[PDB]
RNA sequence: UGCUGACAUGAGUAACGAAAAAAAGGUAUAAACCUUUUCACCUAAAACAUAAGGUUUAACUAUAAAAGUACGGCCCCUAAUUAAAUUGAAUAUAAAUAUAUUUAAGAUGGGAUAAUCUAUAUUAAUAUUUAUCUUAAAAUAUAUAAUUAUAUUAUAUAUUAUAUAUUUAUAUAAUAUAAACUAAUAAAGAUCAGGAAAAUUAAUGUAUACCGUAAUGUAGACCGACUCAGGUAUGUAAGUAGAGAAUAUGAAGGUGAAUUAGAUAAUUAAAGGGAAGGAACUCGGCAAAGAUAGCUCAUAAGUUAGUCAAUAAAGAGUAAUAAGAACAAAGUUGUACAACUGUUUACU
RNA sequence: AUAUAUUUAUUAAUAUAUUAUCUAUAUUAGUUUAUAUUUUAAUUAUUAUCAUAGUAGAU
């Protein structure tokens, strides 16, 4: 149940990199998309125009955010002496860091 | 052995006028670590009525505890009658209840929300308590006037009602509230508690001289 | 344990209606009370004075001075041992608490400099360390005097 | 996931740098039995009285 | 049972019985004090 | 007759009332004290009337009482000490650990509120600018830790 | 940058070793400063103690 | 089976460590972070308060607030015990040191006042553990001061009306559910016979020291190499139901995880059911299956007379007569060894 | 009870929508329950979850 032998270079690379099924395979299946004019996978939907469908839904029907009358009635001088600044850990100022380990879908490229 | 104090049981009016303790009054009393407002009847607060006021105790509202270190007395409201004290001292801890358990979601949405969408906090301090039971004050007094007003002499002038806080800025302004027509009718008056010897420390024998000053008789 | 063979346990005696003590309380709360908003407090109704002894932590009632209004060090120089020599006790006395007093302010300034903005000037640490210097002159000046 | 910027394991602590290290430093004022009292030489004045109090001389 | 925990922390028993009074009082205590400093030791005791 | 609370508070209105101390004057005399305190900035828990101070470790509530009233003229009527921990704290895995100095803080409640001054904007006070030091340190780690291709990958400092 | 360190001086014997490098690796000093700076502020010159 | 450093093979293989999740929005950056709703798990805990411990890990640098009255340490006092301490010459001893007496230290223990809120200082004089049984009486129901049966055996504070110094306190008289539970004297059974130590008045006096206080604390914040199914002290631990802190749900709280998404091949583990046989299996009924009350009756032989046997086996009473949660509850006998309850090889 | 339309005269009523079936005192110290007292604090119908797939009978 162990190793007898080191395996060499050839055996080792022509059980990984040998046989079809191990080694991915050409994507062929791209089209163009109807409405966004770039690329897309077959059979499925261009993300950037369903994306941007989304953003027209999330601003058409977004609720409106819970202003209380109590604050804005509140001049800047009232502000400090009543809610004082605070200092963030080192876990919360990296939290808010989201562009370090979040990002976007890239564009895909355009099909002519 | 007397096992039960003055404290223990809820006094009403009749046990009031035949102890004659205090005169008709409600003490309110604020936490300086969790900015919680306990209300009392008496001078002094004890845990049962710490455990009748805080029911629902959750990670925002946690129950406080009966370390005197950092309880102290914020408002001290005088009333004309007994009955005036003991009805506003059950709309007091009505709305407590009401903001609690029975409506917490329409009080949540007039609370301060930071981002993460919590109740600000510097701490386990969050200062909405504070205000709101200043303002849960105004209208429970504003409903304990309206149910009884003679609006003539009875028998004898009544005493004006008053209000004693520790500094004026924990109240609001004095013109968007606290300045009803119907308070400037009976004139309720902003009054400041005695400032000179240590306030936490001696706050009893403060208590009580205003006390005899209330009962002017 | 709730076998099936169990029965219900008798009802609990009830005071007979001509018995009951009437309660000590008939009135209670009011059920009209709607929930109103929290009224924030209002720095409006203070009267914070210009006099406060506060403000002498203060440079001119500003929060941090900036490096136009800190004395230039070309300009300054901390007190000589034989100068001292020449001071009596009461002006050694006055011109000690007055050392202390702006190494309060000096202190301040350091402090709200080193845990919030991290900078290295340390303007006011150098300016700190020349009242010290004249702090312990002082102090020599008197022994030696004694 | 406590650190959402970590999603695999990489070595990281719970919380700190170092779990081990000198245990050897001086003994401070927060740490220790509920008997301990190291004191901050800030009270020289007055005696502590047969029930368990004080009177400042 | 299960082993691996036998050194269970208590500040009183762990300063009494290894703190540095606990060998400055000593004979025997105060030679390991000494051959500890003479190494160079930084902590001499606990 | 009286109590001996209420015969504290009468010591002390007749303190106020002939301009004299409210408290009581030790005999041990300091001259020419060497302690310097610090102003702190309110938290959110504190009212106007207060205020908080980094005083020295060796320092007894009824010091900063007597230290304010005459150097600064300041009447404190209640004080309340918070003395803080000190972090296990090592620049570098190799050196020893030790921890941060304790702090000791006292809260004094005065008689005239105090409001601290409007904090300078970032374009008067040349100090008062935490940009250029955080940058420094953006940039003094992201160089610490760029250990190979990553050099050439451009700094956000 | 809050450490509370300027109000104390909490390990002397630590600090004492760190700011009295041997001259002789002086140079491993050196080049980590040199490397963790921005070229706007520093001197190709040696620091004299 | 050489020492140290670097890099290979096993190999992008095993594994990612008890587990319920889903949509919308922060955010046309999210399975993993935050919020809202739905679902679910823990609920005599995975909740709430704590002790010890610990790289402060916390709701964070502007940070854990005490004259005392249930707030602890600190301080007074000591137990087990400890001590380069004290006693021509305490005793003994190759040195080290040991012994006896004093003195000092040592909590896991003891320490008056207190919401009608209380005052600790100086001077002077002189209680091991354990139960609330029986009779009595009042009061109640059927019957006729006689009899049967029945809750109660003592305190805990409100109201009404009277008498005292004069609306403050006491006293008197009458009214006021049940089941648990709490501290105090009461009364009393057994032998296993149950800690040590530190006054009252009279006058004067009190400007209230220092330290602890965050969060985790049946655990991702301590001991276990690990964000380890292991180890870790105390009090509450909603209701419904029960003899019960068992078992079932769960109000409130917390929580649903450094792995995810599909088919679930052979095979493995943990479970459910199984015709006709029913131990033929197997070293060996190992494993699994088997419960016709849980309350009230009844209960043999033997025997050391102890319902030991015994929770005796079978049996009976209570709706069940086809069944429908969980937990408690798993037969009889002969022989060898040992009287019995207990202890033992941490890890065969 | 609040809000919007209609009728009536800011009161009352109809229609619609939303929300809730709480709470507080007494019965001698604490908890639970029960009753009386205060308020407006409802009955039905059909679902759902948990108890080994809770369990039995079918399929
Ligand atoms: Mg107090
Ligand atoms: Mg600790
Ligand atoms: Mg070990
Ligand atoms: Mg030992
Ligand atoms: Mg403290
Ligand atoms: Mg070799
Ligand atoms: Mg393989
Ligand atoms: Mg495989
Ligand atoms: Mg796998
Ligand atoms: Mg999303
Ligand atoms: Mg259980
Ligand atoms: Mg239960
Ligand atoms: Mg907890
Ligand atoms: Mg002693
Ligand atoms: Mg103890
Ligand atoms: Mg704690
Ligand atoms: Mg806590
Ligand atoms: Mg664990
Ligand atoms: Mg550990
Ligand atoms: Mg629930
Ligand atoms: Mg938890
Ligand atoms: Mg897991
Ligand atoms: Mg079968
Ligand atoms: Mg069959
Ligand atoms: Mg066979
Ligand atoms: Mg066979
Ligand atoms: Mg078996
Ligand atoms: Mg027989
Ligand atoms: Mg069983
Ligand atoms: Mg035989
Ligand atoms: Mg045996
Ligand atoms: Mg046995
Ligand atoms: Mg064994
Ligand atoms: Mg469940």
């Known amino acids: 149940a162990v190793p007898k032998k080191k395996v060499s270079h050839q055996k080792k690379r022509q059980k990984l990199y040998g046989p079809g099924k191990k080694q991915l395979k050409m994507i062929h299946h791209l089209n163009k998309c109807p409405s966004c004019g770039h690329y897309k996978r077959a059979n499925t939907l261009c993300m950037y125009c369903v994306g941007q469908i989304s953003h027209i839904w999330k601003t058409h029907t977004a609720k409106e955010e819970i202003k209380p009358r109590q604050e804005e009635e509140l001049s800047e001088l009232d502000q400090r002496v009543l809610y004082p600044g605070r200092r963030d850990t080192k876990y919360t100022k990296d939290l808010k860091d989201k562009d370090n380990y979040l990002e976007r879908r890239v564009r895909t490229l355009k099909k002519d | 052995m007397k096992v039960n104090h003055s404290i223990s049981r809820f006094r009403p009016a009749s046990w009031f006028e035949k ?9 309110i009393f604020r936490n300086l670590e969790y900015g919680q407002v306990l209300y009392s009847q008496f001078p002094n607060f004890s845990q049962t009525q710490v455990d009748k006021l805080f029911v629902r105790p959750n990670w925002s509202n946690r129950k406080p505890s009966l370390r005197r270190d950092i309880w102290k007395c914020m408002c001290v409201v005088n009333l004309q009658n007994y009955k005036q004290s003991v009805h506003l001292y059950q709309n007091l801890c009505r709305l407590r209840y009401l903001r609690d358990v029975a409506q917490r979601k329409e ?8 981002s993460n969408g919590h109740v600000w906090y510097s701490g386990q301090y969050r200062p909405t308590y504070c205000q709101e039971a200043v303002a849960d004050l105004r209208e429970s007094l504003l409903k304990v006037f309206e149910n009884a007003t003679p609006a003539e002499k009875q028998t004898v002038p009544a005493k004006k009602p008053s209000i004693y806080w520790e500094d004026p800025w924990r109240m609001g302004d004095k013109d968007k509230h606290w300045n009803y ?8 008056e902003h009054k400041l508690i005695q400032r000179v010897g240590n306030i936490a420390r001696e706050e009893s024998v403060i208590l009580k001289e205003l006390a005899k000053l209330e009962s002017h008789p | 344990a709730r076998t099936k063979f169990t029965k219900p346990k008798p009802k609990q005696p009830v005071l007979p209606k001509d018995k009951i003590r009437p309660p000590t309380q008939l009135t209670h709360h009011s059920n009209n009370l709607r929930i109103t908003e929290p009224i924030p407090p209002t720095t409006s109704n203070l009267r914070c004075p210009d006099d406060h002894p506060l403000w002498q932590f203060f440079s001119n009632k500003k929060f941090i001075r900036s490096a136009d209004d800190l004395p230039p060090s070309s300009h300054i120089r901390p007190w000589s041992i034989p100068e001292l020599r020449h001071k009596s006790f009461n002006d050694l006395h006055s011109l000690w608490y007055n050392c202390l007093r702006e190494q309060n302010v000096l202190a301040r300034e350091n402090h ?14 150098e300016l700190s360390n020349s009242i010290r210097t004249t702090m312990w002159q002082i102090r020599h000046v008197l022994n030696e005097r004694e | 996931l406590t650190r959402p910027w970590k999603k695999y394991r990489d070595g990281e602590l719970f919380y700190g740098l170092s779990k081990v290290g000198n245990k050897r430093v001086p003994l401070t004022t927060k740490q220790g039995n509920k008997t301990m009292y190291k004191g901050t030489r800030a009270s020289g004045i007055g005696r502590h009285t047969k029930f368990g109090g004080y009177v400042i001389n | 049972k299960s082993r691996g ?20 009082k000593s004979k025997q205590g105060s030679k390991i004090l000494k051959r500890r400093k003479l190494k160079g030791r930084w902590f001499l005791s606990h | 007759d009286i109590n001996v609370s209420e015969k504290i508070y009468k010591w002390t209105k007749a303190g106020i009332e002939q301009g004299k101390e409210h408290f009581k004057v030790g005999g041990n005399k300091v001259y020419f004290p060497k302690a310097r305190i610090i102003l702190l900035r309110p938290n959110a828990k504190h009212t106007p009337y207060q205020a908080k101070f980094i005083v020295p470790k060796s320092f007894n509530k009824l010091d900063l009482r007597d230290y304010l009233y005459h150097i600064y003229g300041l009447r404190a009527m209640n004080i309340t000490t918070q003395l803080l921990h000190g ?6 895995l190799q050196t020893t650990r030790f921890r941060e100095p304790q702090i000791k803080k006292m809260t004094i409640e005065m008689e005239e509120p105090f409001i601290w001054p409007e904090e300078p904007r970032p374009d008067e006070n040349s100090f008062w600018d935490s940009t250029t030091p955080d940058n420094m340190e953006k940039y003094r780690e992201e160089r610490l830790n760029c250990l190979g291709s990553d050099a050439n990958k451009p700094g956000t400092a | 940058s809050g450490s509370y360190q300027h109000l104390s001086n909490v390990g002397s014997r630590v600090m004492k070793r760190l700011g009295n490098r041997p001259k002789n690796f002086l140079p491993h000093s050196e080049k980590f400063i040199k490397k963790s700076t921005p070229e706007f502020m520093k001197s190709d010159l040696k620091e004299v103690d």
């Open chain 2, 107 to 114: 009080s949540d949405k007039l609370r301060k929300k930071d």
């Open chain 5, 5 to 24: 925990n036998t050194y269970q922390p208590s500040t009183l028993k762990r300063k009494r019985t290894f703190g540095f009074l606990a060998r400055a």
């Open chain 3, 112 to 125: 709200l400099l080193k845990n919030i903005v991290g900078s290295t000037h340390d303007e006011f640490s």
């Open chain 6, 87 to 92: 972090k296990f704290n090592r620049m570098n």
């Open chain 2, 19 to 27: 102890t004659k303790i205090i005169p008709p009054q409600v003490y």
């Open chain 2, 181 to 188: 027509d119907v308070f400037n009718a009976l004139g309720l």
